[PDB]
Structure formats: C-alpha cells, structure tokens
Amino acid sequence: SVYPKALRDEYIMSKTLGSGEVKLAFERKTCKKVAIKIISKNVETEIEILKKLNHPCIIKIKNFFDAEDYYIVLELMEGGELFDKVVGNKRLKEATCKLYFYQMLLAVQYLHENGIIHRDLKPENVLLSSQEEDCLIKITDFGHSKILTSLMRTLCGTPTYLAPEVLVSVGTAGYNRAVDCWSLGVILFICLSGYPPFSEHRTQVSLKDQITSGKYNFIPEVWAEVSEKALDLVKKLLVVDPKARFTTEEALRHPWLQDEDMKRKFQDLLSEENETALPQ
Ligand SMILES: C/C(=N\NC(=N)N)c1ccc(NC(=O)Nc2ccc(/C(C)=N/NC(=N)N)cc2)cc1
C-alpha cells in the first residue's frame, strides 16, 4: 500500500533504521531528519502519555497519524538502540555503563514522580543520541505503560462483606513501579557483564525458577573487571521482594553514582544539545 496523504504532505519518507518498524524521514518545513515509527493495526494513551512528558532522557513525539496503520513521528536518535552495543557479549566500559545508567535512572525517576510505570524497559527501548560513546540516551516505547485506585475506594467501608484476599493485597499494593527497577537491574547487569543474569544457556534451572529465586548467573571471571560498587547496585535492584528493592531515588544515592566527572559529562552533553536569549 502507500503512506497516507497527510503524512506525505509534511514528510519525505526514506530508509529503514530498524524494526513494528522505524523509518528515516525528512520534515519538509525544516529539511531535518525525523524517525517515523509504524505500528501495524493502546497507541492513543501512549501518545497522550508521551505528549505530557517533558524530560531530556525521554523521547518526544513530534506528530501522529492514525490511518491504515499508526504513524508516530519522533526525534531521530542517531546512535540507534543500546541493544546493538551489548549483543554478542560486547560490553561497555564501566564508565560508559554509568553515564547511560545514570540517565536511565533520571528518566525512570521522572516517570514514577509523574505516576507512570513503563513496564517494558529493555536495551531495545533505550536509544542513543549519537555514535559517540559519551552521549545522551532517551527511553522510548510506552506501549505497555500504565498510569498509577479501586482498592482505596474499597477500603472506605466497613469490610463486613469484603473478601479476605482483598485485605491481604493491601500489604503489597502501590509497588507496581518496582517492576521498572527490576528491569533497570537486568539492563545494568547486561551492560556491565555483556551477558544476561537469567538465561536458559547452559543451566538446568528454568528461567522462571532463576527469576523467582533471584539467583542470577554469576561468572566471576567476566566480573573481575568490574568495580564492587557497580555490582553492589545491581544486587540491590535484583531483589526479589518488591518492597525491599531499591527505588530510583535510592539507586541515584548509591556510591556508584556519586561520580562528579560522570555528572559533569552529562550536563555538558545536555548543554551541547540545547544549543533563546534570557533576561540577565
Ligand atoms: C539512526 C539509527 N541507527 N543508527 C545506527 N547506526 N544504529 C536508529 C536506529 C533505531 C532507532 N530506533 C528507534 O527510534 N526506536 C524506537 C522509537 C520509538 C518507539 C516507540 C515510541 N514505540 N512505541 C511503541 N508502541 N512500540 C520504539 C522504538 C533509532 C535510530
């Protein structure tokens, strides 16, 4: 078939960047490059979540066309996916891990402050600003995300007729955001080590069983490279109990992230990006 005429009106379409599919396009008005995500026919709440969020490490929506398929126009991230930096047991300098992870933490912190849980954080959904190693990252893909109740309403009686399991669920309610911190844990583990914590590669233990026990695959030889501090943070994010797991605030306060050089590099990268006159 063809691209829709409203899209064609504003954009010249071009090569595939990835794949669900992402294409290169040029905005006609500006002659600048954009990315167009095509979702073959919830997207309208993803759009509405993305419209309202404003953070430098979260992807912005430029335009939207709901046609035969959906078309989401976004800023082009020249560095591609973090996934490509970590496949085939490739891995990043610990310093590069920290810079990227710091930014992931700020993004997810901002999400959680604003009542949004992402629910699908993985290396594919972390985009790099450039092909430089030191760059900005943005989190994308909010198609599984949730806005943070019926429980609160339920607890306004008088539980004369209320079922025990509802009363039991009160102990653990309101920690759904901790799933994001788990994922961040897994991504950090991968970035630091070049391999996955939980995997069916050369184990008899099921993936499910590995995850619910929290018994990640530790290969000391791969990790001898890595600081104890980095591994300590991983350990606090890969905690099975969601009430005990580190929050993004706790992670940002961890020794590993008290790194003024890393933080300066990030502030520098932001300035470069931003780049109107001000009173004084
Ligand atoms: C230019 C380029 N890579 N160059 C390179 N040398 N690797 C890019 C490759 C992939 C790439 N990926 C994306 O932009 N990926 C996205 C963007 C948005 C989304 C969204 C919003 N998805 N929503 C959804 N419901 N699925 C998903 C994936 C950007 C740039």
Each as own residue / partner, the long-range contacts of residues 211-219 (CB below 8 Å, 24 or more positions apart, any chain) are 212/240, 213/240, 214/238, 214/239, 214/240, 216/189, 219/193, 219/195
CA distance 116 to 159: 30
- Asked if 16 and 84 sit in the same domain, the reply is no
Ligand 1 test: best mutation among 39, 77, 78, most atoms within 8 Å of CB?
77
- Last residue within a domain, chosen from 12, 44, 76: 76
CA distance 107 to 152: 28
- Asked if 12 and 141 sit in the same domain, the reply is no
Per the document, the length of the chain is 280
Provide the CATH number for the domain around residue 22: 3.30.200.20
The alpha carbons of the chain give a radius of gyration, in whole angstroms, of 21
Cβ(32)–Cβ(16) under 8 Å?
no
State in Å: Cα 77 to ligand 1 middle. Answer: 7
**Amino acid identity, residue 272?**
E
Structure tokens at 203: 């184990």
Residues designated as active site: 120
Provide the CATH number for the domain around residue 147: 1.10.510.10
- Last residue within a domain, chosen from 54, 76, 98: 76
- Asked if 200 and 152 sit in the same domain, the reply is yes
Cβ(99)–Cβ(204) under 8 Å?
no
273 marked ligand binding residue: no
Q: Is the CB of 57 under 6 A from ligand 1?
A: no
- Asked if 22 and 97 sit in the same domain, the reply is no
Cβ(223)–Cβ(257) under 8 Å?
no
- Last residue within a domain, chosen from 16, 43, 76: 76
State in Å: Cα 2 to ligand 1 middle. Answer: 21
- Asked if 38 and 127 sit in the same domain, the reply is no
Measure CA 117 to chain center: 10
- Asked if 63 and 158 sit in the same domain, the reply is no
- Asked if 47 and 127 sit in the same domain, the reply is no
State in Å: Cα 39 to ligand 1 middle. Answer: 12
CA distance 208 to 262: 36
CA distance 39 to 84: 22
- Asked if 67 and 111 sit in the same domain, the reply is no
73 dihedral zone (left: phi>0; alpha: psi -120 to 50; beta): beta
Q: Is the CB of 74 under 6 A from ligand 1?
A: yes
Q: Is the CB of 35 under 6 A from ligand 1?
A: yes
CA distance 221 to 125: 29
CB-neighbour burial class of residue 185 (10 A; exposed 0-12, middle 13-18, buried 19+): buried
CA distance 171 to 114: 23
Counting from 1 in the atom list of ligand 1, the atom nearest the Cα of 143 is 25
268 marked ligand binding residue: no
- Asked if 72 and 116 sit in the same domain, the reply is no
- Asked if 167 and 130 sit in the same domain, the reply is yes
- Asked if 98 and 180 sit in the same domain, the reply is yes
Axis-axis angle for helices 228-237, 94-113 (nearest 10): 30
Which residue stretches of 224-279 are H helix?
Answer: 228-237, 248-252, 260-274
Q: Is the CB of 72 under 6 A from ligand 1?
A: yes
SS3 per residue for 147-210: ECCHHHHHCCCCCCCCCHHHHHHCCCCCCCCHHHHHHHHHHHHHHHHCCCCCCCCCCCCCHHHH
Experimental method: X-ray
Count of domains observed in the chain: 2
- Asked if 280 and 200 sit in the same domain, the reply is yes
Closest CA to 265 of 83, 96, 110, 93: 96
Q: At how many Å resolution was this determined?
A: 2.0
State in Å: Cα 190 to ligand 1 middle. Answer: 20
Q: Tell me, what DSSP letter sits at residue 122? A: S
CA distance 88 to 107: 27
From atom 5 of ligand 1, which residue's Cα is the shortest distance away? 80
CA distance 95 to 101: 10
**Amino acid identity, residue 12?**
I
Containing structural domain, residue 84: 77-280
